[model samples]
Target chain A: EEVLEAKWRHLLARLARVPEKDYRLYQDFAGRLFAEGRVEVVAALLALLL
Target chain B: VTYEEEAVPAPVRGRLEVLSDLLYVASPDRAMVFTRTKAETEEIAQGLLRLGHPAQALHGDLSQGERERVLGAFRQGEVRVLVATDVAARGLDIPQVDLVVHYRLPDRAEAYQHRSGRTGRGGRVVLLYGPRERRDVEALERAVGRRFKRVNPPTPEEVLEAKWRHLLARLARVPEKDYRLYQDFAGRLFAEGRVEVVAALLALLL
Candidate 1:
């Protein structure tokens, strides 16, 4: 899980810099990935918003 | 941006008014109402039928054959209203719905566009919410870049007018042969010389 944690943190930091209006676009993408059962990717994406 | 919140005394009552307006006043041959869960879809469909609407539920739990039958019935107008989850939001197309109701907000902002998109054929999209959901709705407005117009449900008088209009429309379509059959009854009612008698005859026909 260490590698997963690193990747999650890295992606979250990247998404954190995205503008608010653009957040919806990324959120849509994240939702599709999460629905596909990519839990780690969703974790990273939601972390950025939180 | 100013967001207006309306008090919906109960979910069932609010939904009934919206459904009644669409089926009666607006007179859409087909309408789709979306909820967040399969259970909610089934429950709402039952409630609508109990209130005299020809409604069906569409959800992921249905078998393929069951889904096809329900969809076919809806497309042919055998079913006037469809209570559904997001499973019906994408790819499925009916092309003639007069209104789409968001009975519950979608989990994601993008889903709202997909749900509302179903109405682009020739219908309006109405978002129904309780007073407590105002903040989420405002956030949705920001995300969608448009404001939702506020409107009240049809009043009792309006509902009566719509019912009368519908009855008149149905009467206008009576077959020519059928008119001759009812002529005797019509003449008897006229001979009764009471306005209440005519009103009672019309009520019985409806």
Candidate 2:
């Protein structure tokens, strides 16, 4: 879980740099990350935002 | 009236400014950019995003819910640009798209018609091409019995100006109350005799 969270945070930082217009691409990236069984990582990231 | 066509020399790997400018010229509204492959669609979408343009990639890889969500956001004006593969973008009921960009020429003239048909519902269409694709564009022109209007892409300065215009439009709508909160910061900026600070702020805002 720690390793997966680290990878998710790394990708999230990259996605944050991307402009909002390409938000769908960000979602796409997040979707792929979740599909890799990193659902908790995504949830934690969303918690930080919300 | 048939669609109008425009040709510009294709860019090498790092020179997509031509395509980016075309998107700016068609600005202040929705535009659809078509690429031949899913990979190209995502790549171009990412490129536009990095350039500070709002764009989304639509392709077969998206699940049904994801596809619908992207389309809904586009239709609702949450996103102004959509980069898509031919198959993924086909039959979308979106109307009033200001422009359709052909990042690559379609394999056949009929495909061109189908793609360009997405625009001019209540707007205009522009096509981009590389030198190698000229023959195919010519074939499309002949097939459709119309000539494409040759024009140059917007220069880098023009693209910057367009972006500024877009930013100004948004800035114009800021409520007076919103500005109230920034008065101290504004005063401090001026007191520092750093007019360049405002420019830097604008740069970040944009």
Candidate 3:
């Protein structure tokens, strides 16, 4: 579980660097995944992003 | 109008990758994607945003304050795509954009037209459906007064061309000092036969 959260955090930080306009939605949606502890959603989201 | 039949080349990521190529090949300026459920709005928007497309989602449960913020982002070109449900399909002030994609087929003809009619004179609408779900498109066509010029997803060559265009900009943008640092290898590479050298390098890069 902790490993998944760290992965999500890193994904958000990486997303922020590119397109140079990292805004609210990207952070908040991923934030929800962290709060809810939805590991599968995090896995699926990583699949799409990576 | 156009449609892409879902594929199965890659078992897990096949469908999602098709959408990615669709975005690259179509390259919408200001597009809106309509889906059947509020749930899909966020999921689709998430994928688009992940690809650096500046996408946002709008659905019935959104707050008035954030709704305004989302729409405002699209207004000034900050957000290139807005993935939403029928809730934002009509009566909303979102202007007509150059592209429209129905991520989920609308159930009614009016719904399809209302979703697609949001586009402008130069707008192009694409219908996306899975193999079994193709019947919805056929039903939509017979229900409405329009033609769907069914199209295949981006061919390998087309996808590569689009990617190469974006990559070439950076290749030219490389500063002289940086490229000149490679002057020795540059000469050796060309000396080795230009075509074969580049072919080997391209293979390695890919």
Candidate 4:
């Protein structure tokens, strides 16, 4: 969970720089990330919450 | 028109100023505005006209007469602004327009360049900006090797000033009597629907 969160956090940081009106697509990508259940894998990769 | 609706969200008005700036810098006369879909192209064209740009649209929905009218106007400079989908814009040999506005960014860099290449031909061209998938704006910026300038919309006051200024400029160019219809239209539009009048004026360039 922690690793996945970290990856998400990183991605979110990048997403933050995107203009607000233009943020929908990034939000969609993030939604997809959550749906793929890759957060746990990302957490495992980082050796956190695994 | 309706801020509450998902499909008909209030437009980012004065979008054309940024577009015009880019086009002026890029300097293309025969320009194209590319939208993601036919619906989007029509919406954009409407929005642009509503904003006050004398723009036309080219898409599958239009009849042959409509298409010819748009093309004819463009060729004659009576309608210099154009909005269309990628497929509709293809195969035209119009000279490098002073600018191209991408209402929706293309999916690939190749497509981006192709759209941009529509301008800047034989020497001068203007590359306009457009919204893309939020995720890709930055990536696209990086891929293009240039910083994308984010344009802040003009305020209502600014919109009014721009409209008046544009009206004055047009008046300066032609005989005052010729603009009677436009003057009457503007007065009527403003008295009954102030916001709509401003919208129409701002949209003319889009």
Find the candidate with the highest lDDT and give its number: 2
Chain A TM-score per model, please list them. 0.43, 0.40, 0.44, 0.36
Tell me the native contact fraction for each prediction: 0.00, 0.00, 0.00, 0.00
Instruction: Kindly report which residue pairs in candidate 1 clash with one another.
Output: none
The TM-score leader among the candidates is: 2
Report iRMS (Å) of candidate 3. 20.4
lDDT of 3 by residue, B87-144 (tens): 7655657777877777767889988878877776446777777777766677877898
The lDDT of each candidate is 0.61, 0.65, 0.61, 0.51
Per-residue alpha-carbon lDDT of model 1 for B1-206, expressed as tens digits? 12222222225447656665546766678788889989988988998776556789988878888888888998887888889888754564454476777888877878887777777454577777766787877888788877776676767656655765565454555555545433443344334443332332233332
Off by over 4 Å in 2: A1-50, B12-15, B169-183, B201-206
Q: How far is candidate 3 from the true structure (C-alpha RMSD, Å)?
A: 14.4
Candidate 4 lDDT tens digits, B1-206: 00110011113464555554333333334567877788877776676566556677788778778888888888887776788787777775344565566666678776766766665433322233334445566666667665554544335445444554444344355444444324443344334433322322223321
Candidate 4 docks at the CAPRI level of incorrect
Task: Please write out the lDDT profile of model 2 over residues A9-45, one tens digit for every residue.
Answer: 5644653465544333234333343346433332322
CAPRI-style class, candidate 1: incorrect
Q: Judged by lDDT relative to the true structure, which candidate is superior, 2 or 4?
A: 2
Per-model DockQ: 0.01, 0.02, 0.02, 0.01
Question: Residue B180 in candidate 4 has what lDDT?
Answer: 39
lDDT of 2 by residue, B58-110 (tens): 89899989988888889898888898888988664554576888887788777
In model 2, how large is the Cα lDDT of residue B12?
47
Better of 1 and 3 by DockQ: 3
